[model samples]
Target chain A: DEAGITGTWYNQLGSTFIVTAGADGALTGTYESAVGNAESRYVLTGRYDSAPATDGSGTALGWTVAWKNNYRNAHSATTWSGQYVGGAEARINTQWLLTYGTTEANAWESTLVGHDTFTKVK
Target chain B: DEAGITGTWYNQLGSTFIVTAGADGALTGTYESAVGNAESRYVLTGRYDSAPATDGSGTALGWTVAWKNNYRNAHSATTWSGQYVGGAEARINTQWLLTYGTTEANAWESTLVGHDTFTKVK
Candidate 1:
């Protein structure tokens, strides 16, 4: 069920995600990005919830992740509210947000809007 | 000799780095950190140079890394100057800087200073 979201997933952009799923739907992992340069990555921990399926199947999961800059000292967050793509269990099609800043006044200061399909590795 | 810098390395703080060493003394890689939440990551690229040994042997190397936020659209940079530990080739002792911003006007604005010992994983 919820354990379906537990695994290593990398995006088409060469970002790597190593996820550890907890029995209680807790999600913790490391994420690496190969978009800007060579040393772009983060360690993240968060939770996942089972959501209503788009087709009324009653089996969809949602996730939220928070991460800190390992090289620097900044922080950011991301959210995924989508489902597994049709015909492929390893592919996840979902909405994504790249968030930065801390407070509401300055938060959302730099948010990238896009959808990502993460391919499971393990 | 210069090829020794090519590999995967991770720090005690849960940060991961995958590096590729070029034949022309060029260094490139991806770095990930586990500090803030679950989705704090970036993409990076950079170069390396063989530095004079602190002990006068001429076997040590130095590196410089520049990165951009895959999630946020911001940019950062780093520098490493040190040597492999005396007994273990896997362990590297060096100075580290997590830099952000772009120029002298608004850049060099957020810099974190610390030392790191990245252990080779692969």
Candidate 2:
């Protein structure tokens, strides 16, 4: 339904990850951690959604992330998957949410946020 | 025919890539995605056109990708061939950018994005 969302999101609290996102999706704002291996730097409000799937790519948007270390509390929640190749530059699967034993011993620590890619401005 | 487009662009669907594109390419804006750590956040701003064979070392423009999930439904738009022992992080030959079934074929529930790789910033 009105699909045209793009992608790209990174993280580093122990490593390093800068950020950026545009094309009216609204998150056009952060990337500054030159030599990554982190402990500081913040501002990554994620969003980008498109549902209705079965595997083909008729509708499946990108980004809907979450993160928290609001001091040392720890937090996470992510969803990134976008594949639409016509004029090119539309492919991303950056999944997140990783936690371990804190209150309820936690859950939802997925993986696969490797080197990222997204370049489509319209 | 413009050479050094200087890269780095990301997404969070809120148009939040914070921006960056210097060496005069412009748009090196503001950014923030703290834990833009989507489980597997892959990225690629894509755009290259090289033909360096004045004998060797002068060619670039590689990336032809795809996206999938479930059992399988792959994508490739790469051009990462390498051969450099001294300067490091070297290997060249990759150009994969494929899509399939239904119209491109292999209907894995209409899929989304998973086009990853990018960290060539300095």
Candidate 3:
């Protein structure tokens, strides 16, 4: 029996967090908010729609999901994951927009800001 | 009678403008939206209180003006001008930090963004 899953993840300005499934199909989530900052806890919930290799024929197949947070930034991260859905090996490539706030806005300015990405390690 | 006047000015993202006194000390304001890009214009409006030479002592004087654009971004520009206000030789210098938008934001991705500054010549 073989199954695959793909999704996006987020972290603070200068912190690292990883997501992993506990029992092959179950998710374990932990959040750390920046270095020397407070720690946050989160849960991961998602569904695998269909078989990417059979339904969507190509080197890279598409996986879509709608995810939200009941806490924290008070917003949602809506993104799609695409990767080479191959045989035996489960893999995924995703981007994390991680948009916050419940309002639509245009231009804004601030004095200090930071953003960075890291590879998942556990 | 020689009177010194100085304040802050604003322009929609891109525009050309001038500020002049309609009467002896009255400010005549005009705004023009930028070509193609609509979020731009400039205006000159401020108040003059104490006598330039008598009330304030020193070659360097201070003038502060708080302004807002009702028809545009709905933000304000606060500026201070310092120059000698002696005899009929009146000079003023200023810097404009034109800020708009109601809330703070994070810039994760952007395609088009612009900012510029110009002097009020009349």
Compare the candidates by TM-score and give the number of the best one: 1
Off by over 4 Å in 1: A36-41, A50-59, A65-67, A85-89, A102-109, B1-122
Better of 1 and 2 by DockQ: 2
Per-residue CA lDDT of model 2 for B1-122, tens digit only, reads: 12222333332232222223223111223322223222222232222222122332322322211222222223321111111111132222221112222323544433323332222222
Q: What is the TM-score of chain B alone in each candidate?
A: 0.64, 0.22, 0.35
Per-candidate DockQ values are: 0.02, 0.03, 0.03
Best-matching candidate per lDDT: 1
When summed lDDT is taken over every stretch of 10 residues in candidate 1 chain A, the lowest stretch is A52-61
TM-score of chain A of each: 0.66, 0.23, 0.36
Tell me candidate 1's interface RMSD: 18.5
TM-score of model 1's chain A, to 2 decimals?
0.66
Considering only N, C-alpha and C atoms within 3 Å, which residue pairs clash in candidate 3? B11-B41, B12-B40, B12-B41
Q: Where is the poorest 10-residue window by lDDT in model 2 chain B?
A: B77-86
Per residue, candidate 1 scores C-alpha lDDT tens digits across A11-107 of 7777787777556434456677665423555544433332322432222233433333435322333444344332345565444544333222332
Model 3: residue A117 alpha-carbon error in angstroms: 7.0
Model 3's i-RMS, to one decimal, reads 7.2
